[PDB]
Design brief:
A: little secondary structure; B: 896 residues; alpha+beta; 7-stranded mixed sheet; 20% strand; Ferredoxin-2, chloroplastic (chain C); zinc (chain B)
């Protein structure tokens, strides 16, 4: 999972 | 939701019977509201005689209840609600969820809670309602019987083995959708639907003190009954090397993989947010490094990827998957285990971990200071996600501060440790997908473990470093051609230039182009051209389209087009080549330049070719023995006698070289070309660019290619080969007819009136028609009215329906009313006016005009096509849509 | 009829072609693409 959206 | 609303105020409470509820108050928009209730039960909770019951109960609580004996859904219909837009439900393994978006919003709140309380506390679940609903449940069942589900089930069977999940699919079985009695539903309902097993969330323009009294009004009296304790959401992890085949005889899947299963929510004493952040860092680093490892793969594997997925409440699976040239799975699994082994030897690239960590710190910094504001639909999506896993929302502003604090205690040493635990997991799986009839016997576990120890002892190269990114630029063309003639059609705003290399330019100066240039280059270079090899030429076309110029690469191309807001693409049909592109007027030299470079300097990206070879080889292996393959082969000998061309054997495919493909491309690119240009700009601007990039491409006269024309006569065939319980009825019919704009519109009008009547003749449901469609056009290059009618239906009905459609066609010409036509004419008339100044239509018609008239006349007098629509002319044309003398029927039945 | 459907996923854009008569996810599984008009997922 992504916890901090980056792009 | 046009004015973003800030972080809302949360209020949560618990009724005396255990019913839990969350109120989230937005500032706006006005009146909008969203209501949701989760019952913590799903198909994983079913027993053995309860297949698909969780999902059937989902349906059934909308039918009779204590307050609404005619059905809960029907009360909602009578108050203006709509299925799918105003209420819906979803059932997965772990939960059942009920969604409400009341048409009048905040006002309908107590009407909504009355309905939810009826559904969850007072469902009658009557056998007579069940027997009516079964019709709908079977339809949902029958719809998801394709090859994608059967493989999805294969994946769940293997990656989640030793768990409840494989034997408990949501939809259940056909037998239990037919035979399970409503008393089994009531026992399930009465075990699981109790308030301490339920939770409710309300989002929007609401008064929290008021919404809470309503929740008491409709849910507080529910009896407080306990549901069974549960501790079975989790596969039983044990040390092992399990080996599994993922198989379906209609799947082209050709892949191998090695998987590690483990408890992913164990954080080992540290911050569990910090842990989840280590996961993201680790995956981003692994995703970079595994990509580079493409260089290390033998010819038999490609596209090595790492995927991490939840396969329970706490266990995740880490997987390395790669695609396999059919036949080379043993070699491919060795390569996967080799690369897994390399990741055990060497730590992850520290500049990756520094860069990735920094990108995350950047976004978390920004998050920690900008107040969170969202549109309504966004708030719901965010809050629903956190609420489905029974956790309180944490603001994006607060989450940024948490991430910064957890990044401070995280160095690459931690990332490597995190990654090494996954790889040290003792529960391991190896999966194989081998398409079609490819010889395969499943490895035994030691045969795999042997490979693991072979690569454990081997000496291994370090991880690959990042290659530096080649940024491409088009060459300088100084070479100029010359325009040699000009024919003018001022009345269409069209000029037609001849060019010194033989090409020509049909330039239309349409103001509808705005500041963009629209290019369509056509030519007689289809993959059936005499000089070419049909399968090689299509693959050359596809690879060039994707690789770009020879010195470039697929990725650098996609980059370069995006920076220039430019598109250009190759379409090589059987009879024609078409390159299609758009660019801003500014970038006209870039578009013509890119076009010239595809023609004179085409590329083949090594990686793209390798991927495409595998895509072709797995489909060949599948299609040699798949149902889809046998239908296409019978349809061909029914309609054409012989295949016009055929894909190659896998062995020949494996030997194809980039020089042999480029050879094919140049035959196509040498055909003389007509550039249909739509641009609003003076000729003095367009002429120099056309003489430099377009007029200087070497060309050589090509012959027209013969169309693939359906043979005339009456042939029929039946095949019992379908694997799902369905019959497929297709029939084809043509009538040679000369193309005129009118005749084409008359045919499409008649096909509309045809389309609705062949529905009357065949709306008796006792005929069990799942889906049917009817198609008819005056095809302009073939110059014949071509008609296609197709049914999918139950097998027993199946041979009566063509008989009745046939009859419905004989009847049709005397059945077209007048107010059918002039309602269609009014329909056409208005649809036409939508099409003026529509650039897609202007471009389509210019090209068509030159195809039939060799001038641009069809750009004018569209206003007088509507008047070809009279009743006498649509009847005379509806008599021609089906021709009994040219008829091909193909019936596919379930395999007996 | 025969229509170009295309999937955007977190690794690439990978082409499949899908008759009118055919569910888009079935044409992918028939083509050997692993996932779970231009739709995005």
């Amino acid at each position: 999972d992504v916890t901090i959206e980056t792009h | 939701e046009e004015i973003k609303s800030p972080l809302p105020v949360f209020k949560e409470g618990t009724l005396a019977n255990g019913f839990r509820y969350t109120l989230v108050q937005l500032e706006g928009p006005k009146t909008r509201v969203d209501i949701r209730l989760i019952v913590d039960v799903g198909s994983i909770d079913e027993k053995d005689n309860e297949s698909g019951v969780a999902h059937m109960v989902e349906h059934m609580v909308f039918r009779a209840s204590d307050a609404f004996p005619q059905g809960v859904s029907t009360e909602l219909h009578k108050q203006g609600w709509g299925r799918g837009q105003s209420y819906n439900a979803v059932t997965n393994y772990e939960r059942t969820m009920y969604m409400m978006s009341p048409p009048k919003g905040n006002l309908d709140l107590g009407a909504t809670l009355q309905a939810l309380s009826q559904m969850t506390g007072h469902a009658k679940l009557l056998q007579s309602d069940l027997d009516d609903e079964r019709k709908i449940i079977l339809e949902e069942w029958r719809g998801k019987l394709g090859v994608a589900e059967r493989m999805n089930q294969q994946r769940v069977q293997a990656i989640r083995h030793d768990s409840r999940y494989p034997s408990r699919p949501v939809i259940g079985t056909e037998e239990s959708i037919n035979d399970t009695p409503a008393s089994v539903l009531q026992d399930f309902y009465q075990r699981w639907y109790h308030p301490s097993n339920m939770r409710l969330m309300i989002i929007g323009d609401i008064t929290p003190a008021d919404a809470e009294r309503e929740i008491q009004r409709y849910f507080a009296a529910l009896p407080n009954v306990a549901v069974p304790t549960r501790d079975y959401y989790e596969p039983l992890l044990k040390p092992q090397l399990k080996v599994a085949r993922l198989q379906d005889s209609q799947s082209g899947s050709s892949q191998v993989s090695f998987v590690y299963r483990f408890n992913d929510k164990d954080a080992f004493g540290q911050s569990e947010y910090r842990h989840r952040l280590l996961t993201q860092i680790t995956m981003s680093a692994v995703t970079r490094q595994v990509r580079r490892q493409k260089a290390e793969l033998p010819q038999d594997a490609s596209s090595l990827v790492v995927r991490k997925s939840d396969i329970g409440k706490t266990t995740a699976a880490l997987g390395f998957f790669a695609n396999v040239m059919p036949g080379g799975h043993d070699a491919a699994i060795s390569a996967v285990l080799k690369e897994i082994e390399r990741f055990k030897r060497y730590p992850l690239n520290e500049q990756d971990i520094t860069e990735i960590t920094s990108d995350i710190r950047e976004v978390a910094q920004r998050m920690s200071v900008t107040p969170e504001t969202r549109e309504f639909a966004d708030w719901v999506q965010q809050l629903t996600i956190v609420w489905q896993q029974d956790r309180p929302y944490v603001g994006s502003q607060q989450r940024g501060k948490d991430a910064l604090e957890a990044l401070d205690t995280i160095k690459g040493e931690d990332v490597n440790r995190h990654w090494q635990r996954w790889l040290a997991s003792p529960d391991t799986l190896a999966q194989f997908s081998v398409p079609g009839a490819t010889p395969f016997t499943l490895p035994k576990p030691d045969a795999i473990s042997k490979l693991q120890k072979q690569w454990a002892l081997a000496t291994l190269a370090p991880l690959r470093l990042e290659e530096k990114k080649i940024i491409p630029e088009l060459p300088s063309v100084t070479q100029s051609g010359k325009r040699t003639a000009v024919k003018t059609f001022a009345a269409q705003k069209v000029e037609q230039w001849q060019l010194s290399n033989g090409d020509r330019v049909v330039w239309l100066r349409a103001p509808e182009a705005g500041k963009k240039v629209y290019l369509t280059a056509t030519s007689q270079a289809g993959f059936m051209a005499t000089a070419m090899n049909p399968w090689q030429a299509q693959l050359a076309s596809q690879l060039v389209n994707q690789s770009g110029p020879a010195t470039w690469s697929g990725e650098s191309l996609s980059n370069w087009k995006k920076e220039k807001t430019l598109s250009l693409s190759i379409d090589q049909e059987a009879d024609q080549l078409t390159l299609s592109g758009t660019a801003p007027t500014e970038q006209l030299a870039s578009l013509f330049g890119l076009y010239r470079e595809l023609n004179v300097a085409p590329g083949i990206d090594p990686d793209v070719m390798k991927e495409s070879m595998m895509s072709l080889a797995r489909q060949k292996a599948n299609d040699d023995q798949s149902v889809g393959g046998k239908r296409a082969s019978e349809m061909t000998k029914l309609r054409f006698g012989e295949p016009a061309w055929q894909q190659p054997e896998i062995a020949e495919l494996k030997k194809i070289s980039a020089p042999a493909l480029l050879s094919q491309w140049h035959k196509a690119a040498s055909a003389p070309v007509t550039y249909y240009l739509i641009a609003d700009m003076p000729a003095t601007q367009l002429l120099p660019q056309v003489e430099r990039y377009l007029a200087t491409i070497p060309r050589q006269p090509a012959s027209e290619v013969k169309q693939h024309l359906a043979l005339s006569g009456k042939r029929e065939a039946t095949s019992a080969i379908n694997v799902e319980p369905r019959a497929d009825i297709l029939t084809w019919s043509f009538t040679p007819h000369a193309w005129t704009p009118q005749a084409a519109v008359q045919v499409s009008i008649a096909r509309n009136i045809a389309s609705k009547y062949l529905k009357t003749s065949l709306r008796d449901d006792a005929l069990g028609i799942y889906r049917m469609r009817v198609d008819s056009e005056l095809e302009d290059k073939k110059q014949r009215i071509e008609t296609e009618v197709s049914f999918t239906s139950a097998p027993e009905r199946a041979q009566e329906l063509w008989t009745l459609a046939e009859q419905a066609f004989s009847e049709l010409p005397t059945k077209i009313t007048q107010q059918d036509v002039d309602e269609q004419k009014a329909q056409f008339i208005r649809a036409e006016k939508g099409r003026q100044g529509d650039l897609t239509t202007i471009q389509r018609r210019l090209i068509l005009s030159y195809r039939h008239y060799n001038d641009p006349r069809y750009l004018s007098n569209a206003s007088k096509l509507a008047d070809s629509i009279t009743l006498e002319s649509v009847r005379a044309m509806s008599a021609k849509l089906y021709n009994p003398d040219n008829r091909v029927l193909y019936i596919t039945l379930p395999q007996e």
